[PDB]
Amino acid sequence: GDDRELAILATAENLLEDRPLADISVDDLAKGAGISRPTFYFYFPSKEAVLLTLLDRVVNQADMALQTLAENPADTDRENMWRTGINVFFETFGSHKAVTRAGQAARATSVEVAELWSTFMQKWIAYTAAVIDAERDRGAAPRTLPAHELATALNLMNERTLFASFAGEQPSVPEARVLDTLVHIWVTSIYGE
Amino acid sequence: GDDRELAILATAENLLEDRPLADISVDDLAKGAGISRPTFYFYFPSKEAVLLTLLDRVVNQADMALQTLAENPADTDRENMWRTGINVFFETFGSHKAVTRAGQAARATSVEVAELWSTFMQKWIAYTAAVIDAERDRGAAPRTLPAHELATALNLMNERTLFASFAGEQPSVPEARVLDTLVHIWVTSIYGE
Ligand SMILES: CCCS(=O)(=O)NCc1nc(-c2ccc(C(=O)NCCC(F)(F)F)cc2)cs1
Ligand SMILES: CCCS(=O)(=O)NCc1nc(-c2ccc(C(=O)NCCC(F)(F)F)cc2)cs1
């Protein structure tokens, strides 16, 4: 049953909204998805493998949504251009808060996680740099910092700032404030200087 | 022996440069500091308590160094003003890389850690805001974003960007590049828009 893989995926996501990975059992997910402990293993080698797939979909979904924006350029000013771009991440991981949070914590313990995050971060930082450059090229943005070291810092900022907000960490920018907050700093620092 | 408290502090710091907390034993630290396992407990309730004190000194040392800068205003332009300020953190946690790294990882598992970090972050974000405001007041910086939400994002950026660098995480800005990278984004985003 593929239908059964999905039910394990929905169950985990659900159970993570109320408790941490270390507090969810394989039995929880099985019972949850309506199958036995040993049938669970037919789909996944572990619970961590379940978190992994979940993060992968979310990440892949943000990525796929960013491609779409790239291919259909929104007809607007530069400020909004950037805002639409940041919003893929605000919306995408904002609708998957429990997965975001657990997926970030797993980086500390799990190599596939740390490496999945790390690949996409490289990928989105590389895309940020190309756009910054293409902007410097048309004479819209000045040549200040290395475009790649700039992309890097901006992406890491957003990582940490979006996620602290979703968690309501303290301190954090309020979730209703974060988007405008992040866009102001991208835009001033790219066109300024 | 206070001399013995110190030797436990130096030992832990040393052993963290080559391995993680989960790979250091109380015996390691005792033997290391030249005393028995049961004498160790006379100074600290655990190894985590040892990490805690270490982080506390480093954090307190960054804080104390930032006060000093505040009280003796450096006679320079605004760019350098900010650079000197960011550098307290670049220098301070840059000279204590093993403590930084372990201290950040402990946030996930330990409440006193998460709360120590959280207090100072509030404190330094509040100081960033006062200075931004005092600058908006003298007509040097325009009224754009809420000064506090700006400080917040900038501080979280630096957190994540300094620490990824010290770790040589990937991606990261090169340690020789991070300072200028962080100062450009603070300055453009404060005086810009
Ligand atoms: C065709 C023009 C529109 S466009 O291509 O979408 N231009 C705006 C762009 N925005 C980005 C962008 C925007 C935001 C982020 C971002 O928040 N990175 C952090 C990822 C995470 F927060 F950690 F998940 C990364 C890249 C790249 S290009
Ligand atoms: C008297 C004028 C000189 S001044 O007071 O030092 N002005 C410059 C300032 N710089 C700051 C400042 C600079 C940097 C940081 C910072 O990097 N925060 C992150 C802390 C950590 F990276 F996570 F550790 C926080 C605050 C506050 S005020």
Side-chain angles (χ1 to χ4, degrees):
Chain A
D2 163 297
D3 168 34
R4 288 186 285 173
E5 194 155 351
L6 284 188
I8 307 190
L9 288 167
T11 301
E13 169 132 53
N14 284 338
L15 288 172
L16 275 164
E17 315 200 272
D18 299 315
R19 34 172 212 271
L21 194 57
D23 276 55
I24 316 183
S25 82
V26 167
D27 318 69
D28 285 339
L29 309 162
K31 181 223 312 289
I35 59 169
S36 69
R37 187 158 93 204
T39 294
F40 171 101
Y41 287 108
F42 181 76
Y43 300 95
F44 291 97
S46 53
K47 54 184 193 183
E48 287 85 359
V50 196
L51 167 45
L52 182 65
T53 317
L54 284 166
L55 183 48
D56 180 79
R57 303 223 294 210
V58 176
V59 165
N60 268 282
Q61 166 181 351
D63 197 66
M64 276 164 330
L66 189 59
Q67 291 177 239
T68 300
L69 233 129
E71 312 180 8
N72 297 274
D75 171 32
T76 205
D77 57 59
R78 75 195 167 191
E79 166 149 312
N80 256 272
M81 190 253 291
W82 287 113
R83 189 187 311 280
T84 315
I86 296 182
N87 189 70
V88 167
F89 300 102
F90 178 69
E91 285 306 332
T92 295
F93 296 97
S95 309
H96 294 90
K97 253 164 268 206
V99 178
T100 297
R101 190 202 67 237
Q104 290 298 121
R107 285 170 67 197
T109 86
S110 145
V111 171
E112 303 90 320
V113 173
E115 303 202 347
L116 165 80
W117 184 257
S118 166
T119 300
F120 280 87
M121 279 302 284
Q122 296 183 253
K123 177 172 177 180
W124 305 324
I125 277 149
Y127 187 51
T128 306
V131 176
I132 291 184
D133 273 338
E135 284 287 80
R136 285 168 178 186
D137 282 359
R138 49 158 215 124
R143 324 210 159 255
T144 44
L145 301 174
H148 201 267
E149 299 158 6
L150 178 53
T152 303
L154 288 179
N155 266 251
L156 284 180
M157 173 175 70
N158 285 28
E159 193 187 290
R160 190 60 185 113
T161 300
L162 284 161
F163 304 158
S165 279
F166 299 149
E169 281 183 9
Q170 88 176 335
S172 48
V173 172
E175 204 190 318
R177 293 290 310 153
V178 67
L179 184 56
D180 293 342
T181 297
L182 295 176
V183 164
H184 169 265
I185 301 158
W186 290 52
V187 174
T188 63
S189 90
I190 292 167
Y191 300 96
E193 23 216 65
Chain B
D2 163 297
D3 168 34
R4 288 186 285 173
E5 194 155 351
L6 284 188
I8 307 190
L9 288 167
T11 301
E13 169 132 53
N14 284 338
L15 288 172
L16 275 164
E17 315 200 272
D18 299 315
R19 34 172 212 271
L21 194 57
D23 276 55
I24 316 183
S25 82
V26 167
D27 318 69
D28 285 339
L29 309 162
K31 181 223 312 289
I35 59 169
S36 69
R37 187 158 93 204
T39 294
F40 171 101
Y41 287 108
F42 181 76
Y43 300 95
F44 291 97
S46 53
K47 54 184 193 183
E48 287 85 359
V50 196
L51 167 45
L52 182 65
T53 317
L54 284 166
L55 183 48
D56 180 79
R57 303 223 294 210
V58 176
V59 165
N60 268 282
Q61 166 181 351
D63 197 66
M64 276 164 330
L66 189 59
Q67 291 177 239
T68 300
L69 233 129
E71 312 180 8
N72 297 274
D75 171 32
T76 205
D77 57 59
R78 75 195 167 191
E79 166 149 312
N80 256 272
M81 190 253 291
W82 287 113
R83 189 187 311 280
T84 315
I86 296 182
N87 189 70
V88 167
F89 300 102
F90 178 69
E91 285 306 332
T92 295
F93 296 97
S95 309
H96 294 90
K97 253 164 268 206
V99 178
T100 297
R101 190 202 67 237
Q104 290 298 121
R107 285 170 67 197
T109 86
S110 145
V111 171
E112 303 90 320
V113 173
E115 303 202 347
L116 165 80
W117 184 257
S118 166
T119 300
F120 280 87
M121 279 302 284
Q122 296 183 253
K123 177 172 177 180
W124 305 324
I125 277 149
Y127 187 51
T128 306
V131 176
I132 291 184
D133 273 338
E135 284 287 80
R136 285 168 178 186
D137 282 359
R138 49 158 215 124
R143 324 210 159 255
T144 44
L145 301 174
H148 201 267
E149 299 158 6
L150 178 53
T152 303
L154 288 179
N155 266 251
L156 284 180
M157 173 175 70
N158 285 28
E159 193 187 290
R160 190 60 185 113
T161 300
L162 284 161
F163 304 158
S165 279
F166 299 149
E169 281 183 9
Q170 88 176 335
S172 48
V173 172
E175 204 190 318
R177 293 290 310 153
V178 67
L179 184 56
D180 293 342
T181 297
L182 295 176
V183 164
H184 169 265
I185 301 158
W186 290 52
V187 174
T188 63
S189 90
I190 292 167
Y191 300 96
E193 23 216 65

